[PDB]
A paper describes a structure:
A BLAST protein sequence alignment search revealed a candidate lectin from Musa acuminata ssp. malaccensis, which we term Malayasian banana lectin (Malay BanLec). Like BanLec, Malay BanLec has a β-prism-I fold characteristic of the jacalin-related lectin family. To assess binding of WT versus F84T to HIV, we conducted surface plasmon resonance analysis to determine the binding times to, and binding avidities for, the gp140 trimer, which is made up of uncleaved ectodomains of the gp160 HIV envelope glycoprotein trimer. The results show that F84T and WT Malay BanLec, which like BanLec exist as dimers with two CBS per monomer, bind with high avidity to the gp140 trimer. That is, we asked whether disruption of pi–pi stacking in a structurally related but distinct (only 63% identical at the amino acid level) jacalin-related lectin, Malaysian banana lectin (Malay BanLec), would reduce mitogenicity of the engineered lectin without abolishing antiviral activity.
We demonstrate that a single amino acid substitution, F84T, akin to the H84T mutation and predicted to remove the pi–pi stacking interaction, does indeed decrease mitogenicity while preserving antiviral activity. The F84T mutation in Malay BanLec disrupts pi–pi stacking without significant changes to the overall structure of the monomer or to the dimer. F84T and WT Malay BanLec have an almost identical structure, with an RMSD of 0.424 Å between all atoms. F84T Malay BanLec similarly loses pi–pi stacking (the “mitogenic wall”), but otherwise retains a structure that is almost identical to its parent lectin. We thus conclude that F84T is less mitogenic than is WT Malay BanLec because it likely does not crosslink surface molecules as well. F84T-treated cells also incorporated less BrdU than WT Malay BanLec-treated cells, indicating that F84T is less mitogenic than WT Malay BanLec. Taken together, these studies indicate that F84T induces less proliferation of PBLs, less expression of key cytokines/chemokines from PBMCs, and perhaps less activation of CD4 + PBMCs than WT Malay BanLec, indicating that F84T is less mitogenic than WT Malay BanLec. F84T robustly reduced luciferase activity, indicating that it retained the ability to inhibit HIV infection. As H84T is known to have broad-spectrum antiviral activity, we next sought to characterize whether F84T could inhibit additional viruses that are associated with human disease and are known to express mannose-containing N-glycans on their surfaces.
Residue numbers in the entry:
A (entry chain A), B (entry chain B): 3 to 142
């Protein structure tokens, strides 16, 4: 019954799924040459929770969303990194700001420009890095 | 309250929007080197109609959806065609068949695999060709 778009990326790592959330509070991305990890803080059904996916490498970057600020777009690249098909670059855009690009690897681009509605969560595959990423979509 | 993802393509042509449909009955794509047109027969509020977007060129290809068949992916290329930024290649995938690829030109790829839910309508830009395309998403 959900709306899930994706994944883009490789078959490595283990499956992960945040599920949809009515409110995303903050996103923290770790990246070097590629996307090492994504960590999301969200609030739903009366509780706030943080979930970390991917490994321990890369430099951290974080965005704390304002009241009324939501994710409108995700854009990235699927690359070959040391023979592994993973996420090499990622950007998230809100109705107010651009968060990214992080990572430095380009290959096969993907983009989810949400003209109506919002990105409400993430799912994908992960190990030491983010092998694959997808998004939940919800109406505004 | 709708979920619209897109557009991918150029800034030329005129905006068009089919809106979301209860059921997509059939899709006809006209293509040669690039995507000339997309024509959809759809149903909503007990009314079936056909809408054509784009020009009169290219060869036609059609899919008539079986009962229980729905669109679960769209992918293609944004290309440079005679100096215009337009849709050069397009594929629609269902839960049963792959419709396309149509068109001969390559450029920047786009893809919207729907892991959960369906593509329920289209929007875009067009003149003599399909300058840009986007989708409506609904649950299954």
């Amino acid at each position: 019954g959900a709306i899930k778009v994706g994944t883009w990326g490789g078959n490595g790592g283990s499956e992960w799924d945040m599920g949809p959330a009515y409110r995303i509070d903050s996103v923290k991305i770790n990246a070097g040459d590629i996307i090492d990890a994504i960590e999301i803080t969200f609030t739903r059904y009366g509780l706030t929770e943080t979930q970390h996916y991917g490994g321990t490498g890369g430099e951290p970057h974080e965005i704390a969303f304002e009241d009324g600020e939501y994710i409108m777009s995700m854009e990235g690249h699927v690359v070959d990194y040391t023979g592994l098909t993973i996420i090499g670059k990622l950007t998230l855009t809100t109705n107010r700001r651009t968060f990214g690009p992080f990572g430095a690897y380009e290959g096969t681009p993907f983009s989810i420009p949400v003209a109506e509605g919002k990105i409400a969560g993430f799912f994908g595959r992960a190990g030491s890095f983010i092998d694959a990423i997808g998004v939940y979509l919800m109406p505004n």
